[PDB]
Subunit: 125 residues, 4 copies
Amino acid sequence: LPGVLIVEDGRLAAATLRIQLESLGYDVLGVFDNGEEAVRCAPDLRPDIALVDIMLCGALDGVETAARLAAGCNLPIIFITSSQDVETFQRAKRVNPFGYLAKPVAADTLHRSIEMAIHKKKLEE
Amino acid sequence: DLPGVLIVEDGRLAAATLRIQLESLGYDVLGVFDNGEEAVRCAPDLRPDIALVDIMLCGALDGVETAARLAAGCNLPIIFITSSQDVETFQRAKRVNPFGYLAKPVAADTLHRSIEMAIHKKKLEE
Amino acid sequence: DLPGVLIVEDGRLAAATLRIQLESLGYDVLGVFDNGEEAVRCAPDLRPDIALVDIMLCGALDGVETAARLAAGCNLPIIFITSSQDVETFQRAKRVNPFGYLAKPVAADTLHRSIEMAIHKKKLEE
Amino acid sequence: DLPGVLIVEDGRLAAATLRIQLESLGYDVLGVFDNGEEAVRCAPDLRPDIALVDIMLCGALDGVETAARLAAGCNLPIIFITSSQDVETFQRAKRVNPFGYLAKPVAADTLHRSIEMAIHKKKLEE
């Protein structure tokens, strides 16, 4: 079977991909949540392809993990992105959330958003 | 008298960072869920004051449907956690020269097609 | 290219205090108005990114009606500046759907994050 | 929008089949070329979104150098149509970095998914 390496920050996302690949006759060789140990364990695993989360953060981010996988084990890379289109924000609008916090979230902004959100609810009700 | 926070976040680093941040600032982290279905089910028993919900969610319910149910069945204010995928990450990614890009959630049909195309490509080249 | 803030505030010292806080944060304050009718008149010309409205305005248009018009006709996000506790006015304020409520004396750091978050929410949802 | 496709193919049945497959999928076929020299000359003015080029062509310019000039000159994603399996023409083809290689006979859904992934890769990396 063609061997697949997965690098994915999301717990269920990594799992979903594994199960999907395995339902289609693939052999998933390693599933990693960080780039350094993916790049470290990949040579002694010899995969045919790497699937990499473009939005991976940490010691090695998504792009630099892929770069080192492509140069190291001579792997082709497929990047896994989010489908964050304006259409999803149109559906999000309808639930009327307090607002949106982009990753990585700052502590000050996190606290202030939580407290103005709770205060808005209290005042309006 | 800690305000109680429920978090729906699949990302291991974001979910761990947000626990740490919130527990420092003086909040009760009531539960962290990697899917919307569990979140919606556990929430009335947890009685949160607020939900932090990632807009990108694998599982039955997407992030938006998850927040809609948390705003209704549990009477919660919602803050969405969003991604930071700027053009600058795709300019760096170009330099890797990847085979391509697949948006989450990926259909197993598309996933299988792209892999077989990518391997066979790599065979013919270096 | 920092955001353009429009202030609607009856108390002249509070307006000034607000202007001081906003200028110290870096924001450009485009106009300060004490009656709501003329704020709505000037709004399309000076093109603000956000409007800070005193919920307790009286006269020609009240705070709620001034914000209702700015929010709908100029597509401005609204933060209400509050002092009193009249439940009835917070009911009508709900209907303009403001971003939040800031109680005077306003802390600058809350002011800064509210404005950032209000404009950001507006950007994504457009 | 459904992309504009340029075809460079000297096999007359292959050329015909490709033109039919694309049009039945919706695509607008902008031009069909027997030879690379004239493909490279006419393509900047056609303004294609993608080129399907046979890896082997008769004339002054082979497949590999037609596609190299089409990719570098029109900022164009290139899919190669292959049969042939010559080792070092592929090692030269690597240096064009095409989206991929489609072995004849080409399944019309393999072609569709290659074109949509080739364009999306370029759009994202833009």
